[PDB]
């Protein structure tokens, strides 16, 4: 409603770097808000794509940002009569970024890994990896829970059970309030998907450069399954956390599986032990139900509510014809321990191929009315197809069905304006939470400052 669309703030990265593919707010140890920006095709030392991370100080004029430097060199370790190998070319460093406390976690989902032992090998596979940084102290750490040293032959003997070689860990990421990093790995267990959790403190204390394979005893991974409903389900394409079991001691996980059960898609709510509490099923096959998930209490009852995006949902129109527009689903959490019912509200896009619901960002209480609000992205929506971000205000019965405000892309065609979103942080310290929007196609980030209503 009250975001300012006249005086925006633009940040920019190198051309072709996909600057803005992912973004997050970052508060330093002093509470000064900056913007961490992932650029997963930034050139590395060998003039080759490796990705990169940028830490943008808040300036009303925006502009260029300094780099958050990481080690981009391939590693080789000959230990235990084996050969460990990391491959960082086209790893996509910055495809996901997330900030917790004074720590930044940037992941390279397509970092490859291999283990040679004489004429056998583990196969060169995208295990993924995440880089951790404490900018003020310069501390660096890494986390790659899906690396293994098992040779290819063993997986064939076990019919490829517990096969984490293609995790792409860090594809999605989130940190609990307690400081536990939770990584989505949609390729884990031979593309069923998995979650990897470990405390940030233990990741730092147990990491040393060069080891490549080390034990993080406090870590916790989800489990493989023989249920065909999960085969090729990409469990972990999107992840989020919230409070859904009435126990404020436990943190619950929200996972997206957009191809679950033969591309029907699903979203599951689990406890910290990966025991399923709820399952939300897709409405239409190939709609990619679960591409994005968002957790926020919208109706002001203190209970976290759920939002699921299905960017490829095909709306039914006249003369028995379908139209891909996208759809977002709102599930209000019922009082006490009860199952989430049917969707409390359906929001459906209007522009053909707009992909309404590609990203859903909690905004906090934008207009300061006591109810939390959300922003939904249609990266190829709007009458021009250039991209649109729509704001929906919370209310006692959930969300308003019509948007209070529509932000049209200020970038040219193909920018993918809205592919990434982040809100609920007051960057200019004016008392109103603001919104940062990524447009990796134009290698830029736009900041919308909220103003008095």
């Amino acid at each position: 409603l009250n975001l300012d669309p006249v005086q925006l703030t633009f940040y920019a990265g190198p051309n072709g770097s996909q600057f803005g593919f992912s973004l997050d707010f970052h508060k330093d140890s002093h509470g000064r808000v900056a913007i961490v920006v992932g650029a997963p095709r930034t050139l590395g030392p060998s003039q080759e794509e490796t990705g990169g991370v940028f830490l943008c100080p808040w300036r009303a004029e925006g502009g260029q940002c300094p780099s958050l430097l990481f080690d981009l060199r391939d590693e080789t370790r000959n230990v235990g009569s084996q050969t460990l190998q990391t491959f960082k070319a086209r790893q996509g460093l910055g495809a996901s970024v997330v900030s917790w406390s004074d720590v930044i976690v940037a992941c390279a989902p397509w970092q490859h890994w291999n283990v040679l032992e004489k004429t056998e090998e583990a196969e060169k596979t995208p295990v993924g990896s995440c880089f951790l940084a404490q900018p003020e102290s310069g501390r660096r750490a890494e986390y790659s829970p899906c690396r293994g040293n098992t040779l290819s032959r063993i997986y064939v003997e076990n019919d490829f059970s517990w096969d984490k070689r293609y995790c792409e860990a860090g594809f999605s990421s989130v940190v609990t309030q307690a400081g536990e990093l939770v990584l989505g790995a949609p390729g884990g267990y031979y593309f069923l998907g998995l979650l990897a959790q470990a405390p940030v403190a233990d990741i730092f204390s147990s990491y040393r450069p060069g080891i490549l394979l080390w034990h993080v005893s406090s870590q916790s991974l989800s489990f493989d399954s023989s249920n065909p409903e999960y085969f090729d389900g990409y469990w972990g394409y999107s992840v989020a956390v919230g409070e859904f079991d009435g126990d404020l001691n436990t943190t619950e996980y929200v996972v997206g599986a957009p191809t679950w059960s033969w591309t029907l898609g699903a979203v599951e709510i689990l406890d910290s032990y990966y025991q399923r509490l709820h399952r939300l099923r897709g409405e239409q096959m190939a709609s990619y139900f679960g591409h994005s998930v968002a957790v926020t209490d919208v109706n002001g009852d203190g209970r976290h509510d759920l939002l699921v995006g299905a960017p490829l949902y095909m709306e039914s129109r006249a003369d028995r014809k379908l139209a891909e527009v996208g759809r977002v689903y709102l599930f209000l959490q019922p009082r006490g321990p009860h199952a989430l019912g049917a969707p409390s509200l359906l929001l459906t896009g209007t522009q053909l191929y707009g992909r309404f619901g590609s990203a859903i960002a909690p905004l906090g209480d934008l207009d300061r009315d006591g109810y939390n609000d959300i922003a939904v992205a249609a990266p190829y929506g709007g009458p021009s197809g250039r991209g649109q971000v729509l704001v929906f205000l919370g209310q006692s019965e959930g969300l308003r069905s019509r948007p209070s405000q529509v932000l049209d892309s200020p970038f040219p065609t193909g920018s993918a304006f809205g592919f990434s979103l982040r809100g609920a942080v007051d960057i200019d310290d004016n008392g109103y939470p603001d919104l940062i929007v990524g447009a990796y196609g134009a290698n830029q980030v736009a900041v919308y400052r909220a103003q008095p209503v």
Partner: antibody
Amino acid sequence: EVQLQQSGAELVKPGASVKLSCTASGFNIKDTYVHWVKQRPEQGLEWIGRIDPANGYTKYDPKFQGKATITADTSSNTAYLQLSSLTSEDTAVYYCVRPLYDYYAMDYWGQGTSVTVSS
Amino acid sequence: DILMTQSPSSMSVSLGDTVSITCHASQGISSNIGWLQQKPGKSFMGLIYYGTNLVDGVPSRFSGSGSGADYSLTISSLDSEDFADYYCVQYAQLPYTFGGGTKLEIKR
């Protein structure tokens, strides 16, 4: 706290067999590699072999091929070392080892099990 | 197998001295080495892993260095509890092989 608790001292005759136990405490034996090391005053420290308790796969120094047999039981959270065809040269102190962080290191050691072979 | 030559066999030193124990491999092992301590009559306690990394709890006066086939364990300002046996071990190749050992003794 990680602790490796090994079985007590053994006093056996030549030609017999003995089976040493190394029980995990404060952690699951399945977490890491588990090694066995032999020690003597003159010959020093010799690496016998390792086991991955999660799957049972093992590695040995070929010097102990036939004499030593390393096994593990995740049920009882214990790793084992069986020595067959015992000789005075098998009289030694035997340790079980597991790494701290590095997958391949040798950082945590049990208290050692004493074996004496004599008629 | 990889041969680990450790030196010296023993040394007579005093409290506060800065002593170094060397370990030489028969081939390059690229810091895939660990250092161990065995106090008199007691079990083993790991000090260093992967060349230079201190095991959790080990005092900072211990420090490992070196590369290729030559490594060192340096103790700054010896404490009374530092008079013990010390060993190196390579884990670059199977089978793991240990150094001969070094005994620190009190000079008088």
